[PDB]
Amino acid sequence: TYYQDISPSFLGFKQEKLTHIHFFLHDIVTGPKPTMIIASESPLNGKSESPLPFGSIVVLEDPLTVGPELNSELIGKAQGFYVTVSQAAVLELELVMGMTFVFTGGKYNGSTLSVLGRNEIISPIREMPIIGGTGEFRFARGFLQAKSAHVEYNVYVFHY
Amino acid sequence: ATYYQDISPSFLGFKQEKLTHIHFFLHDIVTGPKPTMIIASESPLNGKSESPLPFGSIVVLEDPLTVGPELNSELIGKAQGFYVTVSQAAVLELELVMGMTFVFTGGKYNGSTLSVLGRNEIISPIREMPIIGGTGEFRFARGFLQAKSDAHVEYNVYVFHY
Amino acid sequence: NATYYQDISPSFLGFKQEKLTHIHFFLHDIVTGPKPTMIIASESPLNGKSESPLPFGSIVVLEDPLTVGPELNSELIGKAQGFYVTVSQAAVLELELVMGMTFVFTGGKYNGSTLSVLGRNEIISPIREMPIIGGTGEFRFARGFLQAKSHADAHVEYNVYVFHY
Amino acid sequence: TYYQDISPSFLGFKQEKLTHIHFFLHDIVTGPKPTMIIASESPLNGKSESPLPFGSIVVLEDPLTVGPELNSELIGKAQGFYVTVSQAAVLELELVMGMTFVFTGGKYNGSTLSVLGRNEIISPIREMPIIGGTGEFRFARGFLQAKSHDAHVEYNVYVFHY
Amino acid sequence: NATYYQDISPSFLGFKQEKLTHIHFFLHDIVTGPKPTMIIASESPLNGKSESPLPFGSIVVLEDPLTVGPELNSELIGKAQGFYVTVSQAAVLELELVMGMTFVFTGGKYNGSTLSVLGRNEIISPIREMPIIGGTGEFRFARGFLQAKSHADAHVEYNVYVFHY
Amino acid sequence: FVNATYYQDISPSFLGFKQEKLTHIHFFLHDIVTGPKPTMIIASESPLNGKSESPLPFGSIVVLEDPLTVGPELNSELIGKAQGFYVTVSQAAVLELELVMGMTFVFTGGKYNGSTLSVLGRNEIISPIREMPIIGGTGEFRFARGFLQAKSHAVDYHEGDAHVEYNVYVFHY
């Protein structure tokens, strides 16, 4: 009535904001042309029983949609690579992942987040850290959470 | 086309600081049946000076705070405190050091207070003074206050708190 | 579990970590004896007109001892000095105060340190809160608040919560 | 020289700066117009072997100069009041001060600082908190240290601000 | 005017204040000659099939000089070491890279310190912004971003802004 | 002892704040190359393989699931595993490899079970002290900033086996 909480930008301060981003990643392995490929197959290709033996390198350019249907509203790509890092895994596989997200659509059109984290696919919820970012996401500090082709993503990141 | 939302840091356990604009009118009633201030102790050179408040006078006050400049508007709080005349020249362009607190009555900040110790020359249009601290919703306050001018002053208060 | 992790002070990397300190003491107000700790410093001009023991516009000066416990015998660890002003024109017995006082501790870690306070004191309130407006000593750069507890020659329980370095 | 340290405002951040202010406060009692008057002596004047009994109130307008000589460059004035909070003894007076510093001349022209704290005049060094400030000292969190050298006390002021 | 004031560093009172620094150097990617600065550590499986020189899934590993000025003969600042991968299925000339690399600095105050980087990179875009993911040495707790500028062998202009202590 | 009792210094969580902590972590990384059950693989050979004189030629790519123990013995209490990759990145180097690594420590045991840190940095294996940044974390280690410091306890520079000791300093909430 006689008071309002305003933005520190009024007095010229650059407060940090917390931003929750939601989207779906589609790693597509079957199709006329898919989205990820084996950049270098694992030396134990012949011996392991795993479809992706220890030490496979995969690179990927997965689209990011607003909802779980593939033809949902595109908002960005996830580009980068993962690497198979569980010697014992056969199907329940474990990955280290180095991907960046690039967004197109809205405030964050052009802004990118970077990730490097450990993803053990069998887990219901999988947590990797938001390493940093560009554009609006400069000075990013945060994490993400992937549930599970198409994976639900929940990103929380501090920036300005 | 909205895959994002700027959530509050409280969602993750953090307690970010906030900036609040407070706006209200202060009523120094000097004449009438019960006035709002009184001269708790007078300057030992009262008759000598042509000033109504010779250097070294001490007024105590209790001025109501209203949403609008009419005294009848919604009363949101009150200023209590004192001030000291601090210019020797003086006469009518008085200079005061004021120590005073604001209490509020209703709203988010029902019951919270703000304290201020500062300096104003009444003759100037903008007078700035600091928010030295606060209680309640205004714990840990740090900010400033801008006053615009039997009397009614316009107050703009910018506070950081949590 | 043998343990391979411990939390350390940010001191070890040269940072000056902000600490929150909880200070607990009793403030005795001796109105008896040949040396009272308080005094009306400037009575109100409406002294005779009003029925209050301390009418609108009175000014009190105080020099009160601070002890670790509620008995005066307990360790003297400080002293509050300052002043306050009655700021209710209505009040007869339900006084409203503005206080400008500073706590100087003579005690342990904080011997020589001070906290300053300017705030409001409704004397009907069972728990009254005032803000820590700044400090010196270990209490340099202090931000915080303060809570005084007492119902209506006595004493008063202080709990202080003050961030500093 | 392939690298250089830049201020955070290049990226639009409002970084906090630590400022050291040096000046001399002049405490004039002798002469045709001094700088402090006794606004209210205590009800224990004669009953006290003391020039300022417990409970005296003094109001002050003191000039702040660059050097120790009243003639040196004038940069501001201290205004406010202080209250004698020590009983008996005397010469060993202890005072709680509420004053503000208003600065002329400089990048801090028209800016103020506020102080409320405890002055044991005996002490060689006396420390007091900077409780808030205005102008360029909005949100000031700091302290000052006064060194006891008519009088002229050396002040050294250490203020965080934006 | 005789100035009565001065700004100090907060370390005068013990604090370890954030610092923001600009670093400006040139990175040279010699892809041609007797000794280049990178090699194709793992060729992409779709070599014959793709038209681009560096097909999706290629891994390059680099150890590139950093100079203060754009001539390779310029004063040497440090190394950029690391890897990148081509992350665009359709690109033929307008490639897209996810890059992972470090900068060792042998120069002045920052001798021995490192910064890390992991981000996107559109080779043909004029301004290429990548995050500073962290750092060692003086750049512990590094936080920032970096901008690379080139044109439609090589040398690329680098401007990095980093917060640290 | 005495006059010491009226002040107590407490967690700013008592007032709802989430103060950042500084955590020191100490473990031993075990780099097993030779023998029947090793923790490494050369996911891709350097094209320099035949020509170069280094055991791990420039442009090799390794992938590792190294174990983390509290003490120097491999028999010691297992506290985590390090997983990821690195690339050889010095062309002059023969024995004194230069590595760029990207890797994650997942911890099993105690306060930090399931929490990860992630690391991307240079390490110059011959240095007596190798510093590498902590680039982010998860679980209890969300919003992590910090750095490692690895020191070689035992090491064979021809066969590649190592017992490295790590000391990580990380800030978080």
Short mmCIF file of C-alpha atoms in Angstrom, two decimals, chain C:
data_model
loop_
_atom_site.label_atom_id
_atom_site.label_comp_id
_atom_site.label_asym_id
_atom_site.label_seq_id
_atom_site.Cartn_x
_atom_site.Cartn_y
_atom_site.Cartn_z
CA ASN C 1 34.06 -44.59 8.71
CA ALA C 2 37.51 -43.13 9.01
CA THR C 3 37.06 -39.59 7.75
CA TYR C 4 38.82 -37.82 4.89
CA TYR C 5 37.12 -34.41 4.98
CA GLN C 6 36.96 -31.58 7.46
CA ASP C 7 35.59 -28.06 7.34
CA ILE C 8 38.08 -25.30 7.95
CA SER C 9 37.98 -21.59 8.60
CA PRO C 10 38.14 -19.49 5.42
CA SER C 11 40.90 -17.85 7.48
CA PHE C 12 43.31 -20.48 6.14
CA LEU C 13 43.10 -19.04 2.63
CA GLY C 14 43.34 -15.45 3.86
CA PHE C 15 39.62 -14.53 3.70
CA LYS C 16 37.90 -12.60 6.51
CA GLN C 17 34.82 -14.77 7.12
CA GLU C 18 31.74 -12.99 8.49
CA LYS C 19 30.89 -14.35 11.99
CA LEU C 20 27.57 -14.29 13.84
CA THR C 21 28.06 -13.78 17.59
CA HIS C 22 25.41 -14.35 20.25
CA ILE C 23 25.94 -12.12 23.31
CA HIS C 24 23.99 -12.76 26.53
CA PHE C 25 24.08 -10.51 29.60
CA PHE C 26 21.97 -8.76 32.24
CA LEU C 27 21.76 -4.99 32.62
CA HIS C 28 21.18 -3.79 36.17
CA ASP C 29 19.39 -0.53 36.80
CA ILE C 30 20.14 0.61 40.37
CA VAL C 31 17.74 3.41 41.46
CA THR C 32 18.69 2.81 45.12
CA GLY C 33 21.82 3.78 47.07
CA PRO C 34 23.88 7.00 47.09
CA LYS C 35 25.13 6.23 43.54
CA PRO C 36 22.14 5.69 41.22
CA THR C 37 23.07 4.43 37.71
CA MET C 38 20.45 6.68 36.12
CA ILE C 39 19.42 10.33 36.39
CA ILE C 40 16.87 12.63 34.84
CA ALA C 41 19.25 14.82 32.82
CA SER C 42 16.70 17.36 31.60
CA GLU C 43 13.14 17.16 32.86
CA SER C 44 10.29 17.86 30.52
CA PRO C 45 8.86 21.39 30.39
CA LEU C 46 5.38 19.86 30.96
CA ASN C 47 6.71 18.26 34.17
CA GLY C 48 4.04 19.72 36.46
CA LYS C 49 1.28 19.73 33.84
CA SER C 50 1.50 15.95 33.29
CA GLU C 51 0.76 13.00 35.60
CA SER C 52 3.38 10.65 34.13
CA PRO C 53 6.45 9.93 36.27
CA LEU C 54 8.53 10.90 33.20
CA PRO C 55 6.50 13.10 30.83
CA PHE C 56 6.93 13.69 27.12
CA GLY C 57 10.38 15.08 26.37
CA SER C 58 12.31 13.93 29.41
CA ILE C 59 15.94 12.92 28.96
CA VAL C 60 17.57 10.23 31.07
CA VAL C 61 21.27 9.46 31.27
CA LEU C 62 22.40 6.04 32.39
CA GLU C 63 25.53 4.13 33.33
CA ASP C 64 24.40 0.58 34.01
CA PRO C 65 26.54 -2.48 34.81
CA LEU C 66 26.37 -5.58 32.63
CA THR C 67 26.74 -9.02 34.27
CA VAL C 68 26.85 -12.59 32.94
CA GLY C 69 23.94 -13.53 35.19
CA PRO C 70 20.95 -11.79 36.76
CA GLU C 71 22.47 -11.35 40.20
CA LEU C 72 24.71 -8.31 40.66
CA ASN C 73 27.30 -10.69 42.18
CA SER C 74 27.92 -12.47 38.88
CA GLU C 75 30.95 -11.51 36.79
CA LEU C 76 30.88 -7.89 35.78
CA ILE C 77 31.60 -8.08 32.04
CA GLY C 78 30.54 -4.68 30.75
CA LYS C 79 28.65 -1.44 31.15
CA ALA C 80 25.97 0.29 29.08
CA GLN C 81 26.14 4.05 28.88
CA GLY C 82 23.89 6.33 26.99
CA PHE C 83 20.60 8.16 27.28
CA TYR C 84 16.97 7.89 26.36
CA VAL C 85 14.07 10.21 25.63
CA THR C 86 10.38 9.69 26.37
CA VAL C 87 8.54 9.98 23.05
CA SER C 88 4.88 9.37 23.85
CA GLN C 89 2.65 12.38 24.40
CA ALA C 90 -0.22 10.10 25.40
CA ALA C 91 1.69 7.91 27.86
CA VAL C 92 1.24 8.17 31.61
CA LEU C 93 2.56 4.79 32.77
CA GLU C 94 2.98 3.03 29.41
CA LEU C 95 6.15 4.84 28.47
CA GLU C 96 7.64 4.86 24.98
CA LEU C 97 11.39 5.50 24.74
CA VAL C 98 14.01 6.31 22.15
CA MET C 99 17.41 5.09 23.39
CA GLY C 100 20.90 5.98 22.23
CA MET C 101 23.26 3.79 24.19
CA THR C 102 26.51 1.93 23.70
CA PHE C 103 27.61 -1.34 25.29
CA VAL C 104 31.28 -1.55 26.22
CA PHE C 105 32.42 -4.99 27.29
CA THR C 106 35.28 -5.42 29.75
CA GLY C 107 35.26 -9.21 29.45
CA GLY C 108 36.99 -11.85 27.43
CA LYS C 109 37.45 -11.87 23.65
CA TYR C 110 35.50 -8.63 23.49
CA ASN C 111 37.21 -6.62 26.23
CA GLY C 112 37.54 -3.18 24.69
CA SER C 113 34.90 -3.76 22.04
CA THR C 114 31.69 -1.75 21.78
CA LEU C 115 28.25 -1.94 20.19
CA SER C 116 26.07 1.12 19.59
CA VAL C 117 22.25 1.08 19.59
CA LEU C 118 19.56 3.60 18.64
CA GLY C 119 16.03 2.28 18.62
CA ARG C 120 12.61 2.18 20.26
CA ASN C 121 11.49 0.72 23.61
CA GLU C 122 7.78 0.23 24.38
CA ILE C 123 7.95 -0.57 28.07
CA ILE C 124 4.79 -2.70 28.03
CA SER C 125 6.46 -5.04 25.51
CA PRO C 126 7.71 -8.21 27.23
CA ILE C 127 10.45 -8.59 24.59
CA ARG C 128 11.75 -5.37 23.00
CA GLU C 129 13.99 -5.25 19.91
CA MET C 130 16.50 -2.58 18.93
CA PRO C 131 19.06 -2.59 16.09
CA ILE C 132 22.83 -2.84 16.46
CA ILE C 133 23.78 0.20 14.37
CA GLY C 134 27.57 -0.26 14.34
CA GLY C 135 30.48 -1.28 16.49
CA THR C 136 34.18 -0.89 17.21
CA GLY C 137 36.82 -3.37 18.24
CA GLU C 138 36.09 -6.92 17.20
CA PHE C 139 32.62 -5.51 16.46
CA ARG C 140 33.81 -3.24 13.63
CA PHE C 141 31.31 -3.20 10.75
CA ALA C 142 28.69 -4.87 12.95
CA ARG C 143 25.10 -5.33 11.72
CA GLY C 144 22.47 -6.90 13.92
CA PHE C 145 19.80 -6.59 16.55
CA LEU C 146 19.15 -6.95 20.25
CA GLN C 147 16.32 -8.19 22.47
CA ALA C 148 15.55 -6.86 25.97
CA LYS C 149 13.25 -8.93 28.22
CA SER C 150 11.48 -7.72 31.41
CA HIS C 151 7.87 -7.24 32.67
CA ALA C 152 6.42 -4.27 34.59
CA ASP C 153 15.27 -1.04 41.01
CA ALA C 154 15.51 -4.05 38.64
CA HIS C 155 17.48 -5.76 35.86
CA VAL C 156 16.91 -6.70 32.21
CA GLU C 157 17.98 -9.67 30.07
CA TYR C 158 19.80 -8.85 26.83
CA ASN C 159 20.31 -11.24 23.94
CA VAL C 160 22.39 -9.72 21.13
CA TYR C 161 22.80 -11.18 17.63
CA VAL C 162 25.54 -9.35 15.72
CA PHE C 163 27.37 -10.13 12.49
CA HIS C 164 30.99 -8.98 12.36
CA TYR C 165 34.48 -10.25 11.46
#
